[PDB]
């Protein structure tokens, strides 16, 4: 039924949502694949043709949602070559009844004939919209008989079916009969063949399965279901003007309606057997091939810093090598700025290892990778290592406050003599599989040391262990959790709780003293001619 | 304003047959896309109007399948599969789309029944109670007849009597197909007490010799 | 059940104004959608649309007649009226009301018809007579009887047996226009011979324009 | 040969250019084919092996030019695995002689032994560099009697040797003897088995294939009977020390060095099989993926603007659609910003077609591809176009100013009404092929009103037609042309800059030509075809100044000026340059 407009056709359509462009089309083509199309919603041009008749038998309704030069729903101009001597001589627009919106242009079709009989103000709604049909077809055939001067072509079957319509005063304008009886619906464009929602001949506004509607179904819905804001499954998109269970063509649902592509700050994500746009939340996710390996580049380094911003996923790989860090003179590499390396704290996942074996003296934590949450290991450095830190003189807390899984590999965290910290921690919660001779951990900061100077976790800090010092770089906490800080309370009654994460309660959950506020939080949770 | 022909203007079918009318139109019938009101209509004898189709195609409820529609624009064409006896009457074509709402002439569709009916005589003298009055009527009743043909004579002592006699004639019947007629003689009471025997001859088709049912004056 | 109702003068003198109202049961004219129309139809001859009320108080004419028709409504009354003005005998014909409801036909239900007949005669009302065979012309096994409604002006007279329980064998005769300007009909009925005496066969004749009702025992001539 | 750094250990080579770093090695690994190696130019570095010696007999030298924790071209840490007994024990450095820059670090090698026993200042040439030798073993045997006390291992083969090299106080440091006509050569870094820049045992700052040397093979040199520079034939590169003729493995030259990638304002040419870096020229080239067939976009439109920015190449073909520019509101795309559409100017070369179907009303000409140049045609349009402009009713002129070449298809240009200047184009010099039937050029403003109206080519064009109004819209220039502007005359015989004409295109004299006012100032481009000289004349060319210190093939250049100032040569025996020509005015 549907499709997008403007050689072929995949036009054995009824509407064209959109315009119909026939431009630069030679006598020699299948124009019979539009015989069945019998809406127009953009308009409709036809320019540099050669060919001699536009079958458009049952087109009947042209929209004009988007008008040519900003006048004409229709636009027929220069249709005809000298040397050749073929051109347009007939528009087949027979059953053609309403243009809603823009005007009529026909000029310069030399062949052409029968344009100037018909009469445009019983098609065109707008009567200041501009009509314009001159200097195309001298030497024209008169008209049949038949047609009494009104034709869309010589025969007598190509006449101008001008059937008026004195609609009724109570039908407000648009009627299928002549009483008050027969008034269209208030939701038909056009008129009507019947008083329903199905009878229109095109829609005022959206047309879900035939119905002309006013709104195509809604995504929420006071169904009383909950009697409240409910999951109608009866949902459906805009195609437009046209309502759709599911996009067709190749489209994604943002919000409300279908589009070609998701907007700017949002995403694509596989929801509800359909692909729609999610908001993106932080940034949307950007993968940057990594370092290492099957990469072109050995370490990261001043050239390759500037390759990795805003990137969530690293596809590979990220190596942090002294030759990167402090440069190379013998490729003449210049050493790196350590501001940059702030580059990284959007990163989330990387796919194979993570290898750091120098870091700027004064960054005395990696928290620049705070956020990476997991590292995938599918390859692996050295002995099959997918994290290994070594010689980091000068660190003193790992900070990697949001890993919580090493998909794969081995882990080696070894003579960062000024490290502490990593004593208390469970790998057995971060590291996919069994924790077997698959660590290396030596020769840093010694326990001892670390305890005397106060190097310690955070109370709150559960037995898992934590990534530094403070309560937002546990890795679980002892009581419950108000977001990245652990926190010893939760505000329940003197605030709810679920999973052992403090959160705010919807509006509306009237605070009670000395009782519980929320018990959760929504509208079915907290404790129109209303009273 | 819209003019309104149907085509056969009498129709004679036999039972079984089939049947078409048709209704040309001065204008088109058509009010808006698809709104073409068409309307045809059967007025059996001596009843009111009943609706058959309406939008030109479409049969009203409780109207028999054999009834179709078919038409468009100034021409439609009403047609009956299989003509029954309950079907005489006169059909009308009917416009429901222009201001001036107009009918058509009609068209008298009548049965052909398959085998010859042959009328049943029946004289009826004048009353007692009329001749006291001072006028005279005989009444002769031809009855159930199909071959709608049918002549009678009326004769006075064998004098064949003219422009002193009226008839009268039935409607065709919706079940057997018959007709009846009724013929009267009107005269003067004097007159009527002048001669003695009063007779009506009934030449008809179905009827191999000529029918005379007759009474004289004083018989009771 | 819808059922509309015509009533109105039998006879209309010329140039005066008739007034017809259409009471209806089944219906009510205040529902959105419903209408009631005229329709008239002159004797023997076709149909013709004279106008169209609606719930909206919404009026439509025949045309030619504009001037002179004029529609009114009462759902209260669950009536409908009709005037039409200078009235010339061309008008004389049978009336009927009708109901339209559905928008996609029109005509569905019609009343009986009430029968206007314009001239400047006078009423009068029928002279009936019974009509039996004599005793000596017996035919056979059928045996017919009748009435002779003779003479009356206004053209509605309607003609029954037995209180409307005898319909079979029935013929009430189209009436005739005698020269004397009155019509004339007959209404005969073939009965069983032998149940002459079984049943007894009696036949009423209404002129409602002359208001004369008459019921006439067909006795036979036996004697 | 020479290897790079640690990695781009099978490292059959001499000199390694970078740092030598082993880490995480097994004790079972095989470090023998590190054993011909030489020099070392950055810093060695011993960490986390479990490998029981290390195996550098042949090490003489460590450069330091990179050094470890930026204290140290020596650093050996954590060789020992503690729940294991396989650690290092032993560095075998033999023959070790000299670190140039750079301390030591030894420290936390359990099993690792005499290193306390060596003194390092005899190799370290910083003394203030800083040297720490701690917590290496804590059971360790004595030093063989035959080392003396100073040993790298336990062997009486592995004695740290204390160098005896006497040199007299005038080879001012290292000597191949004891006398003073044994000095080593000045280029030689450490000692030296000769007087020659061969002989070093290393250099002091580069290699030019065994020669120790300042600089390498400068790229040009000065011929004395041309009295200029010239390309030098054995022009040689440098690759951190090594002066290389072709550059090393994945490398492009910049000026005179190797390096990986071209620097940011440069670009990669081939140049005879020597990747070279030359300027880019203010805009670097960037080639982008088109619109059209066998692409993601139907038109340009208000998502794909973004994705222009400065491109040179199309790689394609460019749409422009209505629905593009007036946006889509079925696809719900917005309409476009035509400030953006500037994004083009930057276009020289579109591959496939140029397809214009619709532009902003307010802008008159297509001017956002002025610098286009070429039309390849390689993909086309409809009925094989490769250049279409249609139904566009506001321009008044095409504006491809600097369109050249359409080098194959057909151009159809029809329904620009108010388009005028495209009549007397001849298309002849644009179009590659036999212009016939291959233009379609009909229904834009008729040429009798374009003419009336005065919407013709500027006196200063040729008979080849313009792409607009004015002088800078011509095809060609009916006198000359400077700066792709038409003129009726070069700035010869008066005006500033002087210039002069080369294939009817003005040129300005080169810098040190004198205006001459009434001549001819030059005759072309360069120094040689000045009238008269600015300032001095070296040979047939004039200079700024005489040559003092240009390098030539025998030897460094001085010359002198004379008094009618030109440049003469210099005494040969001249202490550096000169003021005049004898032994007495030098210097
Ligand atoms: C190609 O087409 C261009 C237009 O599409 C031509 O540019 C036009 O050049 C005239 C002068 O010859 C400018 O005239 C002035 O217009 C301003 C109005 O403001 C606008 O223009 C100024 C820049 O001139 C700009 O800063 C503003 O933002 C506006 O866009 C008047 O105030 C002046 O009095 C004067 O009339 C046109 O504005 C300028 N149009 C544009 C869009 O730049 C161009 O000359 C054509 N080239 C060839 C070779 O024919
Ligand atoms: C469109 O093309 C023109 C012509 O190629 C571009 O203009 C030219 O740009 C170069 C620099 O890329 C100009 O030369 C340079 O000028 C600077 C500043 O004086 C000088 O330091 C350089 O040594 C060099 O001479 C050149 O003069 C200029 N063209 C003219 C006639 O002035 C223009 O940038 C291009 N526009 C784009 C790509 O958007
Ligand atoms: C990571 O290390 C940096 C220093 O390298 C810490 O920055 C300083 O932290 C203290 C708080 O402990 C502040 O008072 C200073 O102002 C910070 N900056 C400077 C320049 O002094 C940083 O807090 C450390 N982060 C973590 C999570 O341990
Ligand atoms: C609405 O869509 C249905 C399904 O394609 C189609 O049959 C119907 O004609 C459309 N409505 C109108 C007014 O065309
Ligand atoms: C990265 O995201 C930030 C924040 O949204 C934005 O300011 C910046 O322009 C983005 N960088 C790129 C290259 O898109
Ligand atoms: C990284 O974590 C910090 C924690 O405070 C947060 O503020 C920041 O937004 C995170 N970056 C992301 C999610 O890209
Ligand atoms: C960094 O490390 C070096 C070497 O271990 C040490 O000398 C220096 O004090 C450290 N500086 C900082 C700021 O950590
Ligand atoms: C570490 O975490 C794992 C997660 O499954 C758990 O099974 C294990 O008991 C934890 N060990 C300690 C010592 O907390
Ligand atoms: C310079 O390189 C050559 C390459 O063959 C080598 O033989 C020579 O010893 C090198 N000189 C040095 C490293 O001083
Ligand atoms: C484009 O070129 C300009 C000017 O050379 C430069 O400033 C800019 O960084 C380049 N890149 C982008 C994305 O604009
Ligand atoms: C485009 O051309 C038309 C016709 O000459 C003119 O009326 C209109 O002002 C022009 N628009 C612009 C923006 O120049
Ligand atoms: C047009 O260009 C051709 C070269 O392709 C040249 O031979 C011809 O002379 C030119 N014509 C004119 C009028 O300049
Ligand atoms: C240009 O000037 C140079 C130097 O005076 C001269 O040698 C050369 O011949 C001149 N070019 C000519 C005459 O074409
Ligand atoms: C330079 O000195 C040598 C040796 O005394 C001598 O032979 C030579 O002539 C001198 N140079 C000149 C230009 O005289």
Partial sequence: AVCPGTYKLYERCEVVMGNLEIVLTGHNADLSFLQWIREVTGYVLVAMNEFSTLPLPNLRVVRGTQVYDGKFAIFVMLNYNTNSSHALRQLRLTQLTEILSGGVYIEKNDKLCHMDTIDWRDIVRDRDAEIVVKDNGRSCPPCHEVCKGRCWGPGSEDCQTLTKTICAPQCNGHCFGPNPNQCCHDECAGGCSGPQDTDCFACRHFNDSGACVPRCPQPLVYNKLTFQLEPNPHTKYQYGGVCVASCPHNFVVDQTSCVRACPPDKMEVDKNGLKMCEPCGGLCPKACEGTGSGSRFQTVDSSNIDGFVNCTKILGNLDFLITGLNGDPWHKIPALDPEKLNVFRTVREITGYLNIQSWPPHMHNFSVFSNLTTIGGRSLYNRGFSLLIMKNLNVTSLGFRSLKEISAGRIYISANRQLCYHHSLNWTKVLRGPTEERLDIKHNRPRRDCVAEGKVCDPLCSSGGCWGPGPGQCLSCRNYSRGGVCVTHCNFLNEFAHEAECFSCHPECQPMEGTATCNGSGSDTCAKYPD | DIVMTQTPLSLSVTPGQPASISCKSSQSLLHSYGNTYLEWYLQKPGQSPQLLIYRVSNRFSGVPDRFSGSGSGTDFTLKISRVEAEDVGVYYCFQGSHVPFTFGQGTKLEIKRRTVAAPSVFIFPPSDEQLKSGTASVVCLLNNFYPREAKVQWKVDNALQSGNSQESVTEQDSKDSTYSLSSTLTLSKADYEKHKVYACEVTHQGLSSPVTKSFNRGEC | ?223
């Fill in chain 3, 1 to 223: 059940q819808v059922t509309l109702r015509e009533s109105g003068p039998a006879l209309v003198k010329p140039t005066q104004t008739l007034t017809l109202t259409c009471t209806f049961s089944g219906f009510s004219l205040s529902t959105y959608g419903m209408g009631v129309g005229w329709i008239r139809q002159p004797p023997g001859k076709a149909l013709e649309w004279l106008a169209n009320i609606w719930w909206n108080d919404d009026k439509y004419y025949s045309s030619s007649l504009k001037t002179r028709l004029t529609i009114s409504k009462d759902t209260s009354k669950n009536q409908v009226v009709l005037t039409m003005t200078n009235m010339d005998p061309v008008d004389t014909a049978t009336y009927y009301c009708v109901q339209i409801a559905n928008p996609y036909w029109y005509f569905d239900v019609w009343g009986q018809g009430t029968t206007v007949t314009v001239s400047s005669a006078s009423t009068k009302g029928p002279s009936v007579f019974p009509l039996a065979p004599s005793s000596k012309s017996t035919s056979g096994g059928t045996a017919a009887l009748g009435c002779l409604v003779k003479d009356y002006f206004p053209e509605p007279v309607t003609v029954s047996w037995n209180s409307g329980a005898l319909t079979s064998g029935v013929h009430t005769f189209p009436a005739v226009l005698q020269s004397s300007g009155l019509y004339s009909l007959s209404s005969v009925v073939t009965v069983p011979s032998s149940s002459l005496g079984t049943q007894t066969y009696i036949c009423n004749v209404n002129h409602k324009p002359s208001n004369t009702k008459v019921d006439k025992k067909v006795e036979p001539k036996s004697c």
